[PDB]
Structure formats: C-alpha cells, structure tokens
Write a structure and sequence with these properties.
Elements: E1 8-11, E2 19-22, E3 27-29
Antiparallel strand pairs: 1-2, 2-3
PDB class: signaling protein
Keywords: Hippo pathway, YAP, LATs, WW domain, PPxY motif, signaling protein
Assembly: monomeric
C-alpha cells in the first residue's frame, strides 16, 4: 500500500512518540488509522506542527 489513504502517513518523532503527518494540511496528528488496537486515552497535549521543508 505504501503511504496512508492519500495525503498523509504515519511516522515517528526523535523520541519515538509515533505521530501522523497530513501532507494536505502540512500538519501532523495522533489520529491512528489501522495501527492502534484497544486503548482508553484521556488527554494528549496537542501535536507539534510539522513544517514541510524549511
């Protein structure tokens, strides 16, 4: 399959915090597509804005 649905993809930070990247909004998110079984979240400080290129 390669990339995600189309326009975004899954990646990891320098601390392996597993993050998602949306090539459409040039921003990253925690949204979990087909990789994140059960899990009762509760609070996740907003993700950092990933800039596409300097």
């Amino acid at each position: 399959s390669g990339p995600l649905p189309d326009g975004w993809e899954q990646a990891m930070t320098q601390d392996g915090e597993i993050y998602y990247i949306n090539h459409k909004n040039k921003t990253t998110s925690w949204l979990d597509p087909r990789l994140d079984p059960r899990g009762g979240g509760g609070n996740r400080q907003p993700p950092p804005p990933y800039p596409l290129t300097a």
